[PDB]
Design a protein around this nucleic acid. Structure first.
Length: 289
DNA sequence: AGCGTCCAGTCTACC
DNA sequence: GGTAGACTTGGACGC
């Protein structure tokens, strides 16, 4: 992907943007901390930074950042290096995905922080999106570090070291419920060095699954989401109830277990299963099931 | 009405 | 070996 990048004032401008849409990306069910501003731009808190992203045609405007942070953080965050046009063309050979793609032509898989993704999807279990978004912002406000942008105070996502000194009940004050003990166990295990997140990409996909599932409250799904949305292993297909029913209704025309639904997609899509999972998800929400 | 009953991945208990 | 039922918080839907 070829872009013309320039620093201009307190913002960074990227021209030559393709296969990208803010609304579609931030509402594909992968992230939770990005919110729409009145002009249609999005403000979010990731990697201990607060930025506003705005897309005007093929021009991206990232406010409150510098050329150092753009290449070090945001280039890889929005996965700008990858060609989604080739991915869309390849997947479109299946007629079901072609129909799914036309509704989400701008979905890109974000490369989010390992720790935030882990805790975010620990919170996601048996939980609707609006509540997940609320609990995460509670954790941020309660235990995060304050940063300001345009007069308003925003909060970073709490690190493991910033969570270990609190009891379960204190964590439970974020309205997370029974999930509090899982967050407490997750924070304890990373803080002790018992689970290394920086070196986690060195292991195979199956090894990573096993490493993360050692944390109480992390099963296959949470582990899969961390693997896809944070590690960037795209040959995975994280199966939630929604995608199960989407793959059921549109392909097999029967009913299935999360295991066989998963093995059907990885077989059919291969190294592009993660992208396919995104197009079907947003298409699933667009059709209303 | 307002009060109820159901439900949005993982663990635990028990096969 | 496998899974049914419990699980916080809270919003939807019944009558």
């Amino acid at each position: 992907m070829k872009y013309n990048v320039e620093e201009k004032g307190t913002k960074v401008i990227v021209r030559g943007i393709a296969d990208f849409n803010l609304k579609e990306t931030f509402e594909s069910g992968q992230c939770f901390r990005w919110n729409e501003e009145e002009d249609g731009s999005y403000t979010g808190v990731a990697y201990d930074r607060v930025v506003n992203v705005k897309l005007e045609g093929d021009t991206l405007i990232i406010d409150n950042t510098n050329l150092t942070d753009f290449y070090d953080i945001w280039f890889d965050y929005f996965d700008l290096g990858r060609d989604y046009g080739q991915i869309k063309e390849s997947l479109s050979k299946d007629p079901v995905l072609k129909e799914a793609i036309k509704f989400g032509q701008g979905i890109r898989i974000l490369r989010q922080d390992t720790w935030e993704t882990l805790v975010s999807f620990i919170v996601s279990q048996n939980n609707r999106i609006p509540q997940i978004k609320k609990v995460i912002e509670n954790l941020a406000t309660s235990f995060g570090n304050p940063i300001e942008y345009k007069g308003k105070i925003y909060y970073t996502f709490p690190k493991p070291e910033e969570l270990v000194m609190y009891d379960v009940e204190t964590i439970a004050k974020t309205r997370c419920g029974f999930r509090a003990k899982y967050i407490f166990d997750a924070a304890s295990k990373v803080f002790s060095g018992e689970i290394n997140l920086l070196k986690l990409h060195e292991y195979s996909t199956s090894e990573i699954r096993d490493i993360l599932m050692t944390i109480n409250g992390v099963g296959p799904k949470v582990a899969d989401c961390v693997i896809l949305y944070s590690i960037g292993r795209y040959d995975t297909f994280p199966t939630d109830v929604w995608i199960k029913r989407i793959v059921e209704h549109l392909y097999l025309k029967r009913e299935g277990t999360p295991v066989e639904i998963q093995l059907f997609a990885i077989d059919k899509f291969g190294d592009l299963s993660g992208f396919a999972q995104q197009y079907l998800f947003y298409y699933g929400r667009e059709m209303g099931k």
